[PDB]
């Protein structure tokens, strides 16, 4: 969503 959409696009954190 910001910062954990995505772990910023690398996976999810």
Same mark, same amino acid.
């Given at each position: 969503? &910001? #910062?954990?959409?995505? &772990?910023?696009?690398?996976?999810? #954190?």
């Amino acid at each position: 969503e &910001c #910062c954990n959409p995505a &772990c910023g696009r690398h996976y999810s #954190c």
